[PDB]
């Protein structure tokens, strides 16, 4: 089943040997996801899932090498016998070609039927285990699928796509929003299908189309500006799915180096170009263990936002969240509050829907925990500045503005009384001397002939442009306004 030009690159005895298989599989016209997932899953298994080395399995061997930092003598790596890997490959292909026969699916020149796709879906879905928790670590790869029958939400969609490559269908692709996955197919790839569940609730919309989710302006579907992958992008997803977590507090060094390198490989090949979140991941990695001759983290977060604006209508939230994080961690309040505001600037043209819970919680943390903690910390650093810059006060206000606009036209209310206490308290974190140097203008003349300024977009935030700029923050009042 495997091509000879792939076999020769085996076996893999180090992170580098693995990179070779990826750099070489990435140079073909149809990179093999099934092969690359198996390798990755295999590697991630002995490195993160089961680190104790079996001495009774003459078929499984490990490779010694000098350990990275002065700490330690020798490190062991799971050698990827060609035999083992090829055996799994064949087992996967058997399940597929043996559970679906293209005998009855006339494809009119390079397209796949909605019935075929929905079939390959079902094949994989019914192949799934009955007894397991859907949120556990290290069940993203096909290695997991074939070995223990366990796959997580996104992993299922990846499987369905890999399965189709195995059947020859080269029009079926992975579709990636920021919190979901489904499949795109058809001529020009404009037909879509739901293949996996979402959130805790096993509620699936399988066989249904995304059109309804895109229509309702929810963030799960990104107002139609979600990623449409190609073989190369799907390989990136895979690299980003690598989970280096050994434990809640421990991480696998080798798996981190591995994933970091494979992202660069993908970057140099330019395949990260349309994958903002990938740029983010790569960034965060670097911050911790930088590599010589490579750009700074900060450089990367921006290349990530650039991508968002260019190829996705700047409709993605995470590239800002990523950046805001970097600063917050690096204690740069000004720059942080800026990005969090930029975030709300995107979310404002959305609606908070049932399935958008994940992003809700992401703002809730920022609004109610993270920010009130940079401010609390700031009120102690000057006493022994930024807590006295109006522009920061504007950033905070603009942030709340976006969250208010978001709520507008929404099914479920965003704001409740609990949001207020931390708005009130964060306002009080700024001296009236400053809260008044911010110009809350609505509009001088529009168009053009031939302190800092701030204009609200939300009717809620507009009605309060006065209470926010008082010398005494009317607690009771701002509450009853924020919620309505």
């Amino acid at each position: 089943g495997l091509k000879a030009a792939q076999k020769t690159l085996f076996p893999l005895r180090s992170i580098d040997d693995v990179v070779r298989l990826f750099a070489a599989e990435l140079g073909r016209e149809e990179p093999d996801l099934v092969l690359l997932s198996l390798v990755l899953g295999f590697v991630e298994h002995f490195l993160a899932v089961n680190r104790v080395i079996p001495t009774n399995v003459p078929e499984l061997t490990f490779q010694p090498s000098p350990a990275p930092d002065p700490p330690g003598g020798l490190t062991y790596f799971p050698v990827a016998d060609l035999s083992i890997i090829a055996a799994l490959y064949a087992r996967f292909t058997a399940q597929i070609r043996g559970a679906v026969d293209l005998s009855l699916y006339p494809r009119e020149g390079g397209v796949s039927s909605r019935e075929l796709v929905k079939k390959v879906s079902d094949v994989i879905w019914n192949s799934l285990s009955r007894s397991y928790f859907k949120d556990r670590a290290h069940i993203q790869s096909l290695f997991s699928f074939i070995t223990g029958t366990k796959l997580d939400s996104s992993g299922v969609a990846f499987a369905v796509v890999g399965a189709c490559q195995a059947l020859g269908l080269r029009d079926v692709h992975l579709a990636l929003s920021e919190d979901h996955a489904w499949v795109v197919f058809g001529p020009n790839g404009e037909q879509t299908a739901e293949v996996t569940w979402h959130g805790k609730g096993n509620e699936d919309r399988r066989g249904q189309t995304v059109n309804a989710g895109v229509a309702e302006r929810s963030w799960l579907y990104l107002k139609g500006s979600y990623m449409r992958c190609d073989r190369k992008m799907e390989v990136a997803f895979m690299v980003c799915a690598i989970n280096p977590s050994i434990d809640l507090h421990t991480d696998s060094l080798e798996l981190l180096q591995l994933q970091q390198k494979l992202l660069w490989l993908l970057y140099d090949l330019g395949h990260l170009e349309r994958y903002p979140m990938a740029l983010g991941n790569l960034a965060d990695l670097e911050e911790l263990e930088p590599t010589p001759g490579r750009p700074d983290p900060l450089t990367l977060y921006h290349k990530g936002i650039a991508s968002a604006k260019t190829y996705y209508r700047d409709e993605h939230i995470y590239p800002y969240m990523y950046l805001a994080g970097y600063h917050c961690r690096n204690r740069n309040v000004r720059e942080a509050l800026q990005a969090w505001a930029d975030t709300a600037t995107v979310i404002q043209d959305y609606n908070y829907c049932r399935e958008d819970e994940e992003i809700y919680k992401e703002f809730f943390e920022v609004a109610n925990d993270v920010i009130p903690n940079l401010l609390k910390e700031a009120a102690s650093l000057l006493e022994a500045s930024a807590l006295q810059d109006p522009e920061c006060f504007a950033h905070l206000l603009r942030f709340y503005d976006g969250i208010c606009k978001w709520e507008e036209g929404s099914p479920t209310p965003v704001l409740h009384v609990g949001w207020a206490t931390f708005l009130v308290q964060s306002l009080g974190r700024f001296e009236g001397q400053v809260r008044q140097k911010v110009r809350i203008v609505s509009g001088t003349v529009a168009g053009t002939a031939r302190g800092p300024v701030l204009t609200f977009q939300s009717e809620k935030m507009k009605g309060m442009k006065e209470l926010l700029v008082a010398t005494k923050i009317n607690s009771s009042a701002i509450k009853l306004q924020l919620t309505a």
């Binding site: 069940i139 996104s154 997803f237 799915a241 809640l248 994958y275 994080g325 994940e358």
Partner: peptide, 9 residues
């Protein structure tokens, strides 16, 4: 991290 959507921040 047990499981978060791939490439999430």
């Amino acid at each position: 991290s047990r499981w978060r959507f791939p490439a999430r921040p």
